[PDB]
Amino acid sequence: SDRVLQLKLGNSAIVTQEAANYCCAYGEWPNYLPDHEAVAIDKPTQPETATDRFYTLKSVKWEAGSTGWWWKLPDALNNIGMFGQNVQHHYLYRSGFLIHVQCNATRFHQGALLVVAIPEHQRGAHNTNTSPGFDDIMKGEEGGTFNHPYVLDDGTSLACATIFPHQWINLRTNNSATIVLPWMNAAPMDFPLRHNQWTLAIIPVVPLGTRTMSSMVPITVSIAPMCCEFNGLRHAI
Amino acid sequence: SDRVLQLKLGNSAIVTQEAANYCCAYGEWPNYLPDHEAVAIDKPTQPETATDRFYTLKSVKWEAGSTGWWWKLPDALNNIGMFGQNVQHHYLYRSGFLIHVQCNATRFHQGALLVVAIPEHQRGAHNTNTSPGFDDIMKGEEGGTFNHPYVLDDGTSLACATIFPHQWINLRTNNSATIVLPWMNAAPMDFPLRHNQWTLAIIPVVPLGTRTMSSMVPITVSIAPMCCEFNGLRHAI
Amino acid sequence: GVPTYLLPGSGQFLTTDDHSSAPVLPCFNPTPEMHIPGQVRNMLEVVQVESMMEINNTESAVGMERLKVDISALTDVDQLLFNIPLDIQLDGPLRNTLVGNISRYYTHWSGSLEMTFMFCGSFMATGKLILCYTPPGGSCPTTRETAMLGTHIVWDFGLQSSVTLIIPWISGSHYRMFNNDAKSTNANVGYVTCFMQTNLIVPSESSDTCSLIGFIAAKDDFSLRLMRDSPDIGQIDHLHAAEAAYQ
Amino acid sequence: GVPTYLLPGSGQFLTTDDHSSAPVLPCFNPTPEMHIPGQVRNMLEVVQVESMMEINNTESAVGMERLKVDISALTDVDQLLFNIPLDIQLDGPLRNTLVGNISRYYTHWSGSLEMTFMFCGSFMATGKLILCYTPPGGSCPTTRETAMLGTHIVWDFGLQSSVTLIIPWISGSHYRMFNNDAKSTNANVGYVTCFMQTNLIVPSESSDTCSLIGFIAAKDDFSLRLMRDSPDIGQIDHLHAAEAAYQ
Amino acid sequence: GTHIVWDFGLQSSVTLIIPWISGSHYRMFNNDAKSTNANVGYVTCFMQT
Amino acid sequence: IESIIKTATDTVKSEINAELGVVPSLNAVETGATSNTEPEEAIQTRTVINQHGVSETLVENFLSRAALVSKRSFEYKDHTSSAAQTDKNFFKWTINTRSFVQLRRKLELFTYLRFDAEITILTTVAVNTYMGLPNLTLQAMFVPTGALTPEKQDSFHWQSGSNASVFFKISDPPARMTIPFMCINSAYSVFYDGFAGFEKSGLYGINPADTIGNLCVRIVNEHQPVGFTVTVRVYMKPKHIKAWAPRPPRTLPYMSIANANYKGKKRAPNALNAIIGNRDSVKTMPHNIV
Amino acid sequence: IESIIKTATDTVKSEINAELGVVPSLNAVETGATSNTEPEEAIQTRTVINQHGVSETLVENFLSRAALVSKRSFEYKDHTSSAAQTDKNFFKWTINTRSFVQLRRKLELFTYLRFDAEITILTTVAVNTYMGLPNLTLQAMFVPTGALTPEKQDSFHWQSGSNASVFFKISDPPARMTIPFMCINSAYSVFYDGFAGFEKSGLYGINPADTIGNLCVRIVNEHQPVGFTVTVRVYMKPKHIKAWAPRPPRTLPYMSIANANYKGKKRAPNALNAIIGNRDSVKTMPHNIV
Amino acid sequence: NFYKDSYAASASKQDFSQDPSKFTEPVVE
Amino acid sequence: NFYKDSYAASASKQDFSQDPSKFTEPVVE
């Protein structure tokens, strides 16, 4: 009853048959910006079915010495579809996200994934006092790999990362995880090219293991923006 | 509708056919001094049609290297007509002013005039620490010329001089400007020979230019006192 | 008696405290209030009055030549005439304005601005311009194709010799800072550029070079807060005759 | 005037005093409040979220190997798999938890805890475990006979891959202390041990070593008081670029 | 474009609705497959995982 | 029309507007009026409920800041063999607001001001070896313009039969008292386009009604065997403020306290011929994003 | 559902429960939810009326502690022949909460904070022979980010025409004033996954809205013949606190104030590969009762 | 304000009346 | 609080509303 799920957004749809109950982050659902919280006075564009639809990132190979993967939002979508064109032509954006993470294997495989969405994941670098530069943070669509996922690459702890909106993909139980993210900012709208607000982290807490034949197990991420507004129309940079 | 205007005061009248909407300074109109604000207890003389009438100053020639012109009120009128005789025979005066500035040219001329009435224009001298003397301030009917009109000859800025009651004579648009000044003093009445309260400044922000024949373009100032009272009757000095 | 105890902050002199103090002249009767024209009760009344931009803040522009922009006839289409840096805190064309000087007494600001441009050519001079406001994020647009994709107004010269370019409040949160970093995401406003929409066409007896005067005010949704000292005045010595006040 | 007198404690600066002080910016208007998701109004909301125990806090367990316990098939019955030290104050498996870090800002605590164990083997892996909580007073129980005489749960693996071992609040008075003496009668909580109830039976194509992840949260009868500094952070020098804040 | 992501399992079938997305009301069975009044589009399948 | 404004004005949503005869973006600067073009009339807006308070730009809050108006170090010692121009344990100060330029430029944004002055006196002391700092008693006597100022430390004008004195120590909090609105006019003249007397050799720009009086400050203590440097700072906070007829702010540096004379800086910014610092051309953008 | 909790929840008595289909102890961690298993559902309970108040774990009480944010010793003497990097009777401080790690780790338990800052300034002095401790007057002027900070002790930025200064002595109680919530956003960003400017060479992790301003502190006194070491400590108490989106606490030691870089300790505890100190085996009990 | 003079009181920061039209629209129509 | 600004007041320690279910039960059913 909570294991089958169809997520229809736009011209996209995802069915899954081994799901958990999906996660609404902090009990919140995405909405458009109301008038008593609006700041920018020009009329926003709301390209509803053109941008509020699933976008599927490149799959990553799930291996024995995997540390973990991360994508920063909206940086992982700033060059994809009509979401990316609205990002490049406008100054302000505001959206929630519906993240669906896919990973399946056989009933002889084991492994657990912590699929966690981290708000304002300011990263740190290891064994230096120089801050992480622009190319170390803005990885784009491909995302990055965790250097030290045990501390979440910021001196904190992976053990306490369940305070953040998360699910698990335990291969014994399910093969997908779904997190519904609202707008998470101290600001109503934001400049999407210099600020990331959600980091989707996907972490091998229990590694992949089997004794049957070794197929490739990938992990696929489908991200749907939800309730996109855009202000400040200009040329594309 | 706001371009034709007839200003009838006393036995004087001015018609203009290319005007703007005229300016009432600070939203105020001239009146006589009421009893709850009166100080001097003797009965004032109110020489209504004899003094509340236009007085036309000498025209100034509007040239290529003009910096600007200024007249201080009531000093520009203290020797003219029955206004000047009431000034010299009395100790106190109180009046508003109706300034009309005339300047016309052809439809092939260009140029813009900032016609601004400045309250309490305490002047400064350039490149010295000696204060301006009596002859540098009290120019009388002829008025003075701006030394450095870009700073309004007081270290301030010409750019912000639109905070003061002003109009423009843009030769493309109009050929006259009209400012109606009320009584502007911290005092109810005042000694007219040692204190000036309004300075009419007329400034070439865009200089005079044409490529047709070079006629003389003058600028003429007609000033009508309004609601004159006079107290403290004595001999003329 | 009353048992009291002194708190931290007792005996300090904060220069922004709001208390009652001892009158030095008891039973003094002040001068009665008179109606004086032009009373200001809030400094946002002053900020809404338009005042001249120095768009021509260049060398060989001396004094009042800095207050006007000279446009001429062009033989190429779609050409840039001028651009205006919207950096109020750093020293640009908006600093010596009524909206510019009063805002430099504050750190945070918000609300819309309006740019007014008065054409001061002859009556026979005709022309069309396009005044483009560009939100931040990229470079300043140099071609008319790039610039007109943002907020703009197309202006025909004529009987009404002025347009208003409303610069809308387009920002992330509520306020912007007067930071010395002009390129910051919380301080950069954007760019205003002007192009020939068609051309300045004058006859042979009109002057072939015409002038624009640029004005800027603030609207009534404008706001200022976090008051600071102004950078626009300073001193390193005493003023003249300030020793004579002690003699 | 009012006759007053100063009490003892006048002019002191207690760092936990609760008074009003002088505003440094008069008539400042703050930014309007916006709805932000995830507001915390009491730190006991955070303490009730489960977080991973490091039961495998051993050498040769590097990084994330410390967060899981590997169980295998055994050839002897009733064997001990792991035990968990319930000492929160001293550095054990419960220190780096949400219930562990927030409680080390406090001296006294009370209420029930819940341990959750997720089995992360294959679907084909079957097994039964017994998770025993033992009240204090004796040694930690090494055999299953001794351990199951206390609070326990017997867990069959399957479609629901997790159990909760409620660790009940069983104490003399209302609170326990975070004393450095772990063996004190006012600080010792007891022991949690896990045994094979039957065995881990896997087929030949499943991985023969399966993992448990241990979680711990607090219940809603949980309480904390007597706030103190945390032992979990410290410094002996200045941080880098902290001198640049003065330059 | 229009897609469906399908997980294998207890329900062994999905439906890809190909929506009527056309200029006017009808399309022709023209021998020119590349005509603007006859071409329907494409259906492709990929490995999602 | 006069109304009460507590927050900034809201924004109404607007639509496509294509109407003949109605040009809200066209204006007439020649009338002297500021543009009335709304953001709803120039671009297409949304509804924004604006909650930004306008209370910090109030003229009371803009001007009620305690600012420095006076500052004298004077040697506190035995002055039996000193010069004729030295401060022999006392000083006089003709009260003005034109000596320190932060308060001067702020008050000169207006033509007329009516305010009560809240005066704060902050005395500090330094040993002129080191043996300690004495808790000295100071007397600040307010002498109006028209009375006699003292010529000694121990003169008999300091008895203050009618002049208002304040007696305060260095170890105390600073001495604070309020001076009322003391002008003979209904407002102070910040600028005075006129001459102070009836003869033609008066002072230009200084209205005698504007001057508060004198502030004579002495040390009541007799001298110690060692000398000290006593610095007295006076801070003025305007309050109960009414302001009239706002003015362009001063761009050039001040030269004197007695007049509005101007020299300007040598190069831009704030020069005589260039108030804003220069750029390369009118189509050059200085802080351009690369 | 949001409700008001003043004490911890009570316990209900329970009985033998042997019902099919109902497994309260079985849970699904894969959903992301915490276990809902009650103590009444796992073991057999009694009725306990729980009177333990929950008011000390309030986010107001957890964060309204006055904690040290700044600390400077600076030499108070004649500085006419000193270096270029020394504090010549004054210092500036870019205000942050990230220099001292007790307050830093506590504030970094949250993603967003909205609070008023109550600033307490504690000045102490030591003779740099001994002759006594002077009661010196200090000025702490609050310079916002955007204004000019002073370059001297006796510079003319200290007159504070609009900047808020506090003047306080060492013998007084400590100077205390409240700084409001001064962010341009609706909350401070404790963590900022972004870059501060529009060019790609900005600073990572430092939102410019988060910075309060500068805190310029000088000694108003002129120098004595001897020197002194004046230490100024600044204490911040957050108040009127709203907090959002709690975070994992930092386990590794901080390296810098500018970033979240991590090295870890060399061995466990709080090492990069071992946060908890090691034991012998997973079935080894360290504090076992013998 | 325990002082007997009314000018001794604290600063009066509650005067929210505006009239920008005496500076922005000083025209007669 | 004799100060005219509302942020000058003492700490407000009477906010006993909780919602643990936005962190412990963030699921939709």
Residue numbers in the entry:
A (entry chain C), B (entry chain C): 10 to 246
C (entry chain B), D (entry chain B): 1 to 247
E (entry chain B): 150 to 198
F (entry chain A), G (entry chain A): 1 to 128, 134 to 295
H (entry chain D), I (entry chain D): 30 to 58
What are the paper's exact sentences on this?
EV-D68 is an atypical enterovirus that usually causes mild respiratory tract disease, but is also associated with severe lower respiratory tract infections and acute flaccid myelitis. Following receptor binding and endocytosis, virus particles uncoat by forming a proteinaceous pore spanning the endosomal membrane through which they eject their genome into the cytosol. In this study, we showed that EV-D68-947 is a dual receptor-binding virus that can use both sialylated glycans and sGAGs as receptors. Structures of EV-D68-947 were determined after incubation of the virus either in the absence of a receptor analogue, with 6′SLN (a sialylated trisaccharide), with dp6 (a heparin-derived hexasaccharide), or with LMWH at 33 °C.
Similarly, EV-D68-947 infection was neutralized by soluble heparan sulfate as well as fondaparinux (sulfated pentasaccharide) and dp6 (a heparin-derived hexasaccharide). We did not observe density corresponding to dp6 or LMWH in the EV-D68-947 structure, either because these ligands, in contrast to Sia, interact with the virus via a multitude of low-affinity and/or transient electrostatic interactions or because the bound ligands do not occupy all icosahedral symmetry related sites. Structural analyses showed that, like 6′SLN, both sGAG analogues induced movements of the VP1 GH loop into the VP1 hydrophobic pocket, causing displacement of the pocket factor, as previously observed. This indicates that both Sia and sGAGs can prime the uncoating process. By contrast, determination of the ratio between the number of EV-D68-947 full and empty particles after 1 h incubation at 33 °C showed that the sGAG analogues dp6 and LMWH, but not 6’SLN, promoted genome release. Unfortunately, we were unable to determine the exact binding site of sGAGs on the EV-D68-947 particle by cryo-EM.
